[PDB]
Structure 1
Amino acid sequence: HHKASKRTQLRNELIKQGPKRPTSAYFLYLQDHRSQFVKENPTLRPAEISKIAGEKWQNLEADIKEKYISERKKLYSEYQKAKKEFDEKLPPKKPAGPFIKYANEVRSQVFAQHPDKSQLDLMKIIGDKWQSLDQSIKDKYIQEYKKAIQEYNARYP
């Protein structure tokens, strides 16, 4: 929907060269037994080899499905750490605006009072609450943002 701004493009390009999600468990069984399914089944398309591997997967003994599941869990948590560290060194986004700040304060109370509404209807309610605020109260949130952006610009000139 929203065409990436030039700061967002850099962030997106930076992200694209960071750590990536590890492979799935089912895939791990493939990478170990790729030369075994062709040696054993040399007569169907490469896509058909995959279909029997998935049939093999749904009917395979549980110990087996667990072993390679264990490997995905190890690979993912090391990716989790690696992604966490990377993400922290990324160029920080701008501070949220006055409304976002207000919304992140009253959201708990508003949900507690409208538990029947979806979050999207909740944000509609929160948006109308902001519109209704006393001007001196909006000013508090506009001043918080002024302080936040002044600090942000002092930290990244």
Structure 2
Amino acid sequence: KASKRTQLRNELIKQGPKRPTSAYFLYLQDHRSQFVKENPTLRPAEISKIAGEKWQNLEADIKEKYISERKKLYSEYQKAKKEFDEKLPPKKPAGPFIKYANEVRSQVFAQHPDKSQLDLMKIIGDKWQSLDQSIKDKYIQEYKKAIQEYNARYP
């Protein structure tokens, strides 16, 4: 259940740029009217089933075109997505354990090549548990500066 700030982001992200239409769908729009002219008898659900197999069928010249147009459209979206996401309110600084895990995950993975990252996180948890206090405090004190700057920057 999202909290007040995640609702805001979620609501803010929702008004962000939307993913571009599928490459097929661009081809569908062009031959949608023709296709209705091809057949008024069949259901709209039937419409898309027959139309679907047209797309597989198209010669590469026309097909690829659409695909390429989708590539170009997606690229325009992804630029907007990066600039949109950078501008929106920042999440809170990660906690002491997270920063620690982030520093040692690389060595812990090399010492456990078989383990998935979920098991790495379990491992790093017990590593954090066994950490000396003084070492933990370094992460805890470091977090204090983190939210301190975060609170002074964003009061």
TM-score range for the pair, normalised by the shorter chain length = over 0.9
Partner residue, 1:94:
92
- 8 Å contact 2:93–2:150 — kept in the other structure? yes
* 1:106-145 deviations in Å (ceiling 9; x for gaps): 1111111111011111110011111010100000000110
Structure 1 gaps of 5+ residues are none
Q: Shift of residue 59 of structure 1?
A: 2.5
State the TM-score, normalizing by the size of structure 2: 0.97
* Structure 1 stretches of 4+ moved >4 Å: none
State the TM-score, normalizing by the size of structure 1: 0.96
Q: Shift of residue 57 of structure 1?
A: 1.7
1:72 aligns with 2:70: yes
Q: Shift of residue 76 of structure 1?
A: 0.5
* 1:79-98 deviations in Å (ceiling 9; x for gaps): 00101111111011100000
* 1:61-89 deviations in Å (ceiling 9; x for gaps): 22222110001111111100101111111
What is the correspondence of 1:5-84 to structure 2 with a 5 Å cutoff?
Answer: 5-84=3-82
Over the matched positions of the two proteins, sequence identity in percent amounts to: 100
**CA RMSD of the aligned region, Å?**
0.8
Q: Shift of residue 41 of structure 1?
A: 1.4
- Counterpart-to-counterpart distance in 2, 1:125 and 1:35: 59
- Counterpart-to-counterpart distance in 1, 2:59 and 2:114: 44
Moved more, 132-141 or 49-58: 49-58
Q: How many residues align?
A: 155
Q: Shift of residue 42 of structure 1?
A: 1.3
Structure 2 gaps of 5+ residues are none
